Design a protein around this ligand. Structure first.
Ligand code: CLA
Ligand code: CLA
Ligand code: CLA
Ligand code: CLA
Ligand code: CLA
Ligand code: CLA
Ligand code: CLA
Ligand SMILES: CCCCCCCCCCCCCCCC(=O)OC[C@H](COP(=O)(O)OC[C@@H](O)CO)OC(=O)CCCCCCCCCCCCCCC
Ligand SMILES: CC1=C(/C=C/C(C)=C/C=C/C(C)=C/C=C/C=C(C)/C=C/C=C(C)/C=C/C2=C(C)CCCC2(C)C)C(C)(C)CCC1
Ligand SMILES: CC1=C(/C=C/C(C)=C/C=C/C(C)=C/C=C/C=C(C)/C=C/C=C(C)/C=C/C2=C(C)CCCC2(C)C)C(C)(C)CCC1
Ligand SMILES: CC1=C(C/C=C(\C)CCC[C@H](C)CCC[C@H](C)CCCC(C)C)C(=O)c2ccccc2C1=O
Ligand code: SF4
Ligand code: SF4
Lengths: 132, 33, 742, 63, 162, 80, 41, 144
């Protein structure tokens, strides 16, 4: 279910079949023209749409344009060369901008920023001042 | 001797760098080392 | 009827209220200043009318009235010049002997020892030598008196006030609607037939009745005084038939279709006037007549209110091939709903035109007594090369402003615009190669010559004595133009220019024109020209094609036209915006045009310009050093830049000592630019914080907080000083060099 | 501590307004908030922000 | 004298400069008729030039072997007119501007919109302030030994370091 | 990969999460501020390092912070 | 005309009037008392 | 009519099928060049390639040489073609010494593959024979 497009030279490279490639799925109620992140234009097909891209940003940039410009909503996948797929956006079905009970704290310092140690204190260690 | 500069300068100027650029290339592109 | 007049009455009240509130035009600046960045934003956004309102009608009204303001400043400029020519010039003394009297229309006041700038020019007159060619242009019009220049100056002031009034009238009192502006087919018919067609007709009318017979008497040797008033040429046919004996027929051979009776004033002789060294006025009168018929006929190609004619829309939409897909569909909405797309064409055309104009005025000099004034020839040529250079890149800037703001994908499915964006990696990578191919070859020819010569091996250099690179294609074309009079142009008496070969024209012992032979030193330089244009196009083209997105930034269009970067991740994002592409390409245009004017200044001085004596012994200015001194960089550095610098550096104590000061002043400004271009903002803002502290310590600080110049702005400052200092240093070097050899 | 409307001096060192004065607007009575005090300023910082949250031990009272 | 310099009225090379500067303008004067505007302008220029050499001769300046005037800034009181007296003059005008400009910022500070009065000057107020800096050495001295010239150390924001 | 740390001065106004162009940050439950939510950096390996999150943070000094780290193909931002 | 007066009080207009009056101040003094290297006059 | 479509009916792949990329001329021409011909030992692939390159690399050395105007203009330049081929071969040795990996299992059912360490070595030695031999062949063809 790929959208209507005449092709372009700004698509995927070897990295796709050798390193991870990304696909994005969305559902549209009607046929409308949208801008390609690597290409100028394309007509989306009513029903489910499937697009393959080369970067997570390119996929997420299309989502942003699909969101506040068309009122529609999508899923990102990471595809490996062997065939294993990963589910990325949204992580738990709920968007990262909205709090969801069940999420946890990652990478949080429990103090303000002026409270980091001097670099001379962590001398000859394999760390850094912001990892204490 | 008085015949030495016509022996060393091609060796130092053309030969030594071609071996040294070849050696570093193999070292820089070698995965487990 | 589809073409009508729609005007809104009393649209904007005229009060001094907004004058007292700077930044009223935008939503963010109207709150007032908090930091000093606000002062800078005030100026950068003042003419950005598109970002002030959302209505296309209100943007169009602002543009229209601003055009009246731009023209009113041009009329004031023209009215000044004529005023200076009438009260602070030596025009009369020049008219009596235009071979010995130098030209001047500016006089300086004596206040700090600066009177030395009033040169001893001639005709009991002291002033600054001006090189704009006002004098030569006045002679060709048949001026001959200061009284006549005074009327042009009063008429220029009246026209200037009429423009000021029209711009105020069309923005406040009679503001025309959006429907009026969107009439392309009407507008084209009026500019072709009315502005260009009737402009050439009336001008031709002035040339036949006023400019032609006065010039004939000036050329024969009659003093200005004995020449009658211009209006007396309009009344007595007796005076007109003595000079051109076909006025005895009157206007009857025009309506009988016997136009060959007028071969007295509608010539096709070619060449130049042996007396003045300019083009034959009789050829120029024929030139404007043939133009004006062409322009008036061309202003009937579009359909307005009567069925007949072409609609611009059905033309473009018919052009589609099996490689182009939809072809030209959509280019109407584009070019009738966006002012940026219009300037992008227009500035590219007007800039190309000014380059074209400069190439045709040195080869076929149209004014009398201008071809031997080498200071005017050199000044006028470079000027149009610079104005052409800036306007060309300015077209590419608006092409990229269009892609960011006015471009929409839904309006362009599968058309030529959509398709260029689709293989944009292919246009850029192929151009990229052509650039690496042209630079290694054209510039490597000079390196080879630099090293071969230094190693004591001139037998192996690319030269006219070693391995020749003869420009055989351009030499072939020269022969065609030389043999053209009689054969290909059977009614032409002489060649269009004497550059393609022919005879040597001389006025006052100085050479006006000569054949310009092309050898291998020519050939090598033409590729440098090729090469620097291809690189400039590589930066500007890339800026337009990647204005909306790239593999690097997929949402570049949301960031805008001019943003500094997208941060220090993804490697380096500096100068990714399409504004920064315009910024880089400005340095190339500079590089390209500098080599053009260097090539022109040296080739003319080596192989054309000079004096003569008995038996045609030509002595050139630099003595023919062009074939064996410009093939190496050392030759360009030692014979062009070092040798010809002697005037500007030894100008002290003389009347051209202002050129020596501006020479140093522009070397200073150019170096001053490098402080802005090499550094960046966060070193300067920390520097300001220690300074602010010394103020806070003394109980005082400005409430408008001092902030370093922004990233984008610090680049635009460094570029404006780079151009000012660079172009200026050359400006001072060119005039003090050419005033001494003229 | 301060009240609403009190004029304080910022004692945070990495704040833009260290050793500078300004006016308390709201004090969160709930002590679970770590920085309960909204303090407003008349001069902006480098990000053009006019206010910030602080703790009670980071502000001094002027009189 | 100082540095082996000679006074300009007794320098043989300063006198030669005077002659050659006049000779250059006289040889330019000969190409014009006597009543015309270029002859009256160059005649006025040679008067200005001749008065420039006379002025220096009695000035009391020092010349070198180059024939040009030199200036002495050791602090000698005999060459005061060269640096001291125009120095005291500049200090009076430069300290007048800085004092008056500072009075303005301090005045419009206690206000709703101080920034509004820096882009759009309150001219009646500014005009008043500009002429109050005629006695600045007394006004800058009253505030130094008051406490209103320099602020305290706990009023200046400082970089994290110190 | 890059390192993104989140300090306690976070007032939980979700503006960093809305600015991230590669979905690195998210909002989680927290009981230390009015909004009872703190930013978190669970996927720092998609972090390209463009610092858009810090341009969006209203606190002084910033609550979110990006530190340069070893570069992979993902943080280099390569499409090849 | 209290709005034209506020327009004449804006910083760039006041700067050009102040400078025009001050450049012409220096030009006039250099017209009557020229060539003053030092006080000697 | 349309003469431009996505390569292999994959619109999102970053390639375009044009008459320069995939037309009948460019298909049959590229399929018969020695770097892509079916039925060639990697020695033979390198031989041919070398046979066609060493022959024209001769030209610019013999004509625009430092000793082009001497009685030993042909010798001067032929020697310098051999020196050019020695540099190119040296780039072929080092490239294959690093791009390909040695094989553990003696298992080898495709001895014909070019993109391997063993075959690249054969491909490299065939280039050197064919390029020195074609350098010598027009040494004979120009000595006339
Ligand atoms: C010729 C080129 C040039 C010039 C003129 C300067 C000038 C300056 N740089 Mg520099 N800079 C340059 C190249 C140059 N830069 C380059 C290539 C780099 C590498 C990127 C830098 C990097 C750099 C840095 C990092 C620093 C400087 C600093 C300075 C300042 C030194 C203080 C000073 O000299 O005050 C004199 C001011 C001038 C010479 C500017 C010209 C002013 C003119 C108009 C005065 C005219 C004379 C007289 C006063 C006329 C009276 C005025 C009239 C109204 C009465 C000054 C603004 C430092 C600074 O800003 O500290 C204060 C600083 O930290 N620059
Ligand atoms: C025959 C009719 C005619 C003529 C001569 C012009 C001429 C012009 N138009 Mg224009 N225009 C026309 C019809 C015409 N228009 C119509 C019908 C429309 C509506 C579709 C427009 C819409 C239009 C727009 C939207 C704009 C112009 C602009 C311009 C100016 C282009 C700048 C230039 O080359 O300056 C050359 C300047 C001169 C030659 C000086 C001439 C000055 C005045 C106007 C004299 C002309 C009046 C009259 C014909 C003279 C009679 C001569 C007398 C001896 C008999 C130019 C003055 C642009 C501009 O600058 O606007 C101000 C612009 O933005 N036009
Ligand atoms: C566009 C500008 C223009 C203007 C204003 C004039 C104006 C004039 N021309 Mg004319 N003329 C022009 C262009 C112009 N011409 C051109 C372009 C040519 C060459 C193709 C001529 C060739 C020409 C000749 C040969 C003669 C005139 C004459 C005249 C005068 C009387 C014409 C008359 O009353 O006929 C009546 C008006 C109409 C029928 C309308 C008049 C001053 C005559 C003249 O000089 O008389 C003294 C005359 O003999 N003209
Ligand atoms: C007909 C010509 C034309 C027109 C109408 C415009 C119009 C516009 N351009 Mg544009 N442009 C042009 C030619 C033109 N340009 C050319 C030739 C170039 C290439 C140099 C550009 C490059 C360009 C860029 C790169 C940008 C624009 C922008 C803009 C827009 C806002 C401009 C503004 O507010 O500036 C206000 C005007 C000024 C601040 C004046 C400053 C001018 C310089 C610094 C001073 C010149 C020095 C002086 C001549 C000599 C000094 C001597 C010294 C001794 C004093 C506006 C739509 C900007 C935009 O946002 O687009 C929407 C933008 O980013 N243009
Ligand atoms: C003298 C200074 C200088 C030089 C040499 C270059 C060189 C180049 N710039 Mg430029 N550039 C400069 C200043 C300079 N720049 C400045 C000041 C700026 C700031 C505005 C820029 C901004 C800039 C941009 C924005 C762009 C360039 C581009 C280019 C490239 C043009 C392609 C080409 O022909 O390369 C060929 C190399 C040369 C012409 C120089 C050397 C020629 C040699 C001698 C011949 C061949 C040698 C051989 C290959 C090696 C043998 C020698 C070795 C064994 C020792 C080239 C690498 C463009 C580019 O990359 O497009 C392709 C481009 O887009 N530059
Ligand atoms: C790129 C610019 C350039 C060019 C064209 C030349 C040209 C030349 N140099 Mg050189 N030279 C250059 C830059 C350049 N130089 C620079 C920058 C330096 C300074 C370091 C020197 C220093 C230098 C020295 C010291 C000497 C030369 C010499 C020579 C000559 C012979 C070189 C030779 O045999 O090479 C070998 C040439 C080749 C292998 C040619 C390969 C190119 C082929 C023809 C490309 C074919 C493309 C093809 C059309 C693609 C389509 C294929 C399709 C149809 C299938 C020749 C005239 C020598 C001499 O005596 O001069 C007379 C010499 O001693 N050069
Ligand atoms: C510093 C070291 C160095 C030395 C010793 C040389 C030596 C030489 N160069 Mg060279 N060169 C160098 C650096 C050096 N180069 C660099 C850095 C550059 C780039 C800027 C160049 C660019 C250059 C050019 C462009 C040219 C030379 C040429 C020459 C030859 C001199 C002209 C002559 O009479 O030969 C005439 C040559 C002969 C009579 C036959 C010589 C044949 C050689 C010796 C065969 C070597 C075979 C062997 C397999 C090489 C293996 C190389 C590698 C494995 C180490 C000579 C062999 C010229 C040349 O090659 O002449 C053809 C020439 O055109 N040089
Ligand atoms: C130059 C070649 C040329 O003029 O061909 C002309 C060729 C004609 O295409 P079409 O017949 O599809 O064009 C029909 C309409 O677009 C004409 O307006 O244009 C191209 O195919 C573009 C190819 C880019 C050329 C690559 C460089
Ligand atoms: C330099 C200058 C100036 C001046 C100018 C002038 C002086 C102008 C003039 C102009 C003119 C003076 C024009 C005229 C015009 C005319 C015309 C253009 C006519 C035409 C006509 C016709 C076209 C006719 C037709 C017909 C016929 C033929 C037949 C039938 C009938 C009829 C009628 C239809 C000014 C001041 C502005 C400013 C500054 C500069
Ligand atoms: C220009 C052109 C073209 C192209 C062409 C070409 C590119 C060609 C090439 C050609 C070539 C490039 C050739 C080659 C040849 C080679 C040869 C002919 C070789 C031979 C060799 C031999 C025979 C052998 C040797 C040997 C050996 C190996 C061993 C030892 C012994 C000997 C010595 C015997 C075309 C068609 C597209 C089109 C038109 C234009
Ligand atoms: C010097 C410099 C500054 C400092 C420059 C500043 C802060 C602008 C100062 C402009 C003044 C305030 C305008 C008035 C000009 C002078 C007061 C008068 C000079 C003119 C003479 C002819 C008298 C930057 O802010 C900057 C930012 C980004 C990249 C590079 C740089 C950079 O190089
Ligand atoms: S550095 Fe950039 S990509 Fe990474 S979390 Fe911040 S905004 Fe997102
Ligand atoms: S880090 Fe900044 S943007 Fe993110 S939640 Fe906290 S205050 Fe909001």
């Amino acid at each position: 279910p790929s959208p209507i497009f005449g092709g372009s030279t700004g698509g995927w490279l070897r990295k796709a079949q050798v390193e991870e490639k990304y696909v994005i799925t969305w559902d549209s109620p009607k046929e409308q023209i949208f801008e390609m992140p690597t290409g100028g234009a394309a007509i989306m097909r009513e029903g489910p749409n499937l697009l393959k891209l080369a970067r997570k940003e390119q996929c997420l940039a299309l989502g942003t344009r699909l969101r506040s410009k068309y009122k529609i909503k999508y899923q990102f996948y990471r595809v490996f060369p062997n065939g294993e797929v990963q589910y990325l956006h949204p992580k738990d079905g709920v968007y990262p901008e909205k709090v969801n009970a069940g999420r946890q704290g990652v990478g949080q310092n429990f103090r303000s920023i002026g409270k980091n140690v001097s670099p001379i204190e962590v001398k000859f260690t394999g760390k850094q001042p912001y990892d204490l | 001797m008085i015949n030495l500069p016509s022996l060393f300068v091609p060796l130092v100027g053309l030969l030594f760098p071609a071996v040294a650029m070849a050696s570093l290339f193999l070292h820089v592109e070698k995965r487990l080392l | 009827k589809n073409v009508q007049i729609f005007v809104e009455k009393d649209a904007v009240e005229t009060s001094f209220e907004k004058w007292s509130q700077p930044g009223h035009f935008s939503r963010t600046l109207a709150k007032g200043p908090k930091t000093t960045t606000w002062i800078w934003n005030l100026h950068a956004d003042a003419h950005d009318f598109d970002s002030q309102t959302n209505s296309l009608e209100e943007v169009s009204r602002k543009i229209f009235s601003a055009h009246f303001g731009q023209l009113a400043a041009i009329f004031l400029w023209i009215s000044g010049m004529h005023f200076h020519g009438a009260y602070f010039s030596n025009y009369s003394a020049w008219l009596s002997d235009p071979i010995k009297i130098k030209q001047s229309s500016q006089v300086v006041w004596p206040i700090v020892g600066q009177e030395i700038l009033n040169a001893d020019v001639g005709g009991n007159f002291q002033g600054v030598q001006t090189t704009s060619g006002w004098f030569q242009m006045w002679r060709a019009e048949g001026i001959t008196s200061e009284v006549e220049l005074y009327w042009i100056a009063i008429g220029g002031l009246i026209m200037s006030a009429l423009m000021l009034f029209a711009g105020w009238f069309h923005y406040h009192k009679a503001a025309p609607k959006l429907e009026w502006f969107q009439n392309a087919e009407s507008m084209m018919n009026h500019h072709l037939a009315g502005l260009l067609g009737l402009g050439c007709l009336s001008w031709s009318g002035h040339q036949i009745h006023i400019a032609l017979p006065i010039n004939k008497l000036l050329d024969a040797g009659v003093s200005p005084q004995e020449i009658p008033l211009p209006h007396e040429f309009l009344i007595n046919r007796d005076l007109m038939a003595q000079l051109y004996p076909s006025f005895e027929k009157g206007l009857t051979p025009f309506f009988s279709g016997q136009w060959g009776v007028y071969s007295d004033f509608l010539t096709f002789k070619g060449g130049l006037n042996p007396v003045t060294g300019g083009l034959w006025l009789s050829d120029i009168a024929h030139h404007h007549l043939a133009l004006s018929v062409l322009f008036i006929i061309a202003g009937h190609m579009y359909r307005t209110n009567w069925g007949i004619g072409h609609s611009m829309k059905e033309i473009l939409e018919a052009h589609k091939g099996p490689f182009t897909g939809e072809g030209h569909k959509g280019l109407y909405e584009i070019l009738t709903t966006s002012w940026h797309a219009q300037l992008a064409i227009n500035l590219a055309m007007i800039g190309s035109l000014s380059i074209i104009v400069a190439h045709h005025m040195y080869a076929m000099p149209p004014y009398p007594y201008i071809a031997t004034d080498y200071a005017t020839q050199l000044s006028l040529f470079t000027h149009h090369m610079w104005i052409g250079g800036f306007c060309v890149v300015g077209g590419a800037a608006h092409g990229a402003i269009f892609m960011v703001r006015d471009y929409t994908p839904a309006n362009n499915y599968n058309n030529l615009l959509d398709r260029d964006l689709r293989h944009r990696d292919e246009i850029i990578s192929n151009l990229n190669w052509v650039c690496i191919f042209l630079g290694c070859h054209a510039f490597g020819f000079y390196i080879h010559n630099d090293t071969m010569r230094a190693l004591g091996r001139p037998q192996d250099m690319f030269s006219d004595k070693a391995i020749q690179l003869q420009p055989i294609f351009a030499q072939w074309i020269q022969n065609i133009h030389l043999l053209a009079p009689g054969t290909t142009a059977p009614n032409a008496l002489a060649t269009t220019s004497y550059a393609f070969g022919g005879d040597i024209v001389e006025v006052g012992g100085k050479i006006a024109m000569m054949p310009i032979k092309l050898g291998t030193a020519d050939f090598m330089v033409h590729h440098i020209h090729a090469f620097t244009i291809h690189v400039t196009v590589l930066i500007l083209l890339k800026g337009v094609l990647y204005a909306r997105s790239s593999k690097l930034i997929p949402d570049k269009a949301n960031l805008g036209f001019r943003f500094p970067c997208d941060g220090p991740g993804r490697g380096g994002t500096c100068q990714s915006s399409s504004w920064d592409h315009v910024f880089l390409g400005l340095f190339w245009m500079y590089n390209a045009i500098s080599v053009v004017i260097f090539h022109f200044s040296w080739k003319m001085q080596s192989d054309v310009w000079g004096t003569v004596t008995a038996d045609g012994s030509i002595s050139h200015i630099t003595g023919g050093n062009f074939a064996q001194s410009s093939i190496t960089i050392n030759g360009w550095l030692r014979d062009f830049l070092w040798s010809q610098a002697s005037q500007v550096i030894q100008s002290y104590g003389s009347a051209s000592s202002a050129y020596g000061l501006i020479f140093l002043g522009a070397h200073f400004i150019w170096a001053f630019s490098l402080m802005f271009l090499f550094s960046g903002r966060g070193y300067w803002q920390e520097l300001i914080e220690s300074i602010v502290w010394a103020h806070n310590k003394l109980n005082f600080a400005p409430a408008i907080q001092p902030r370093a110049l922004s990233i984008t702005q610090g680049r635009a400052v460094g570029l404006a000083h780079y151009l000012l200092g660079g172009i200026g240093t050359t400006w001072a070097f060119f005039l003090a060099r050419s005033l001494s050899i003229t | 501590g301060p009240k609403r409307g009190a004029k304080v001096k910022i004692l945070r060192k990495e704040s833009y307004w260290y050793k500078g004065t300004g006016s308390v607007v709201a004090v969160d009575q709930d002590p679970n908030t770590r920085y309960p005090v909204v303090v407003r300023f008349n001069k902006v910082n480098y990000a053009n922000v006019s206010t910030n949250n602080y703790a009670l031990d980071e502000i001094q009272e002027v009189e | 004298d100082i540095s082996g310099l000679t006074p300009c009225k007794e320098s043989k090379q300063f006198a030669k400069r005077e002659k050659q500067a006049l000779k250059k303008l006289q040889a330019s004067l000969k190409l014009y008729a006597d009543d015309s505007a270029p002859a009256l302008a160059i005649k006025a220029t040679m008067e200005k030039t001749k008065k420039r050499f006379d002025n220096y001769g009695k000035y009391g300046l020092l010349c070198g072997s180059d024939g040009l005037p030199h200036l002495i800034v050791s602090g000698d009181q005999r060459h005061w007119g060269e640096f001291i007296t125009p120095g005291i003059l500049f200090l009076y005008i430069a300290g007048w501007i800085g004092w008056v400009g500072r009075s303005y910022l301090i005045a419009i500070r206690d206000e709703k919109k101080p920034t509004q009065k820096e882009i759009i000057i309150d001219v009646p107020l500014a005009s008043r302030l500009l002429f109050r800096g005629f006695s600045w050495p007394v006004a800058a001295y009253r505030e130094l030994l008051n406490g209103e010239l320099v602020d305290a150390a706990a009023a200046a924001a400082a970089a994290a370091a110190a | 990969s890059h390192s993104v740390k989140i300090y306690d001065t976070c007032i939980g106004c979700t503006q960093c999460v809305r600015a991230c162009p590669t979905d690195v940050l998210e909002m989680i439950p927290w009981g230390g501020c009015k909004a009872k939510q703190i930013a978190s950096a669970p996927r720092t390996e998609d972090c390209v390092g463009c610092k858009r999150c810090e341009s969006a943070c209203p606190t002084d000094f910033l609550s979110v912070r990006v530190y340069l780290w070893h570069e992979t193909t993902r943080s280099m931002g390569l499409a090849y | 005309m209290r709005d034209l007066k506020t327009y004449l009080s804006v910083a760039p207009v006041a700067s050009t009037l102040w400078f025009a009056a001050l450049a012409g101040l220096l030009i006039e003094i250099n017209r009557l008392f020229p060539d003053a290297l030092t006080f000697p006059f | 009519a349309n003469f431009i479509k996505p390569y292999n009916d994959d619109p999102f792949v970053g390639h375009l099928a044009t008459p320069i990329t995939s037309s009948a001329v460019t298909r049959s021409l590229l399929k018969n060049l020695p770097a892509y011909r079916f039925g060639l030992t990697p020695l033979l692939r390198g031989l041919e390639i070398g046979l066609a390159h060493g022959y024209f690399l001769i030209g610019p050395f013999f004509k625009l040489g430092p000793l082009r105007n001497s009685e030993i203009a042909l010798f001067a330049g032929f020697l310098s073609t051999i020196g050019l081929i020695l540099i190119l071969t040296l780039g072929l040795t080092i490239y294959g010494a690093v791009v390909f990996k040695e094989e553990k299992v003696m298992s080898s059912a495709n001895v014909n593959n070019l993109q391997t360490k063993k075959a690249w070595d054969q491909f490299k030695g065939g280039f050197f024979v064919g390029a020195c031999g074609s350098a010598g062949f027009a040494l004979i063809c120009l000595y006339v």
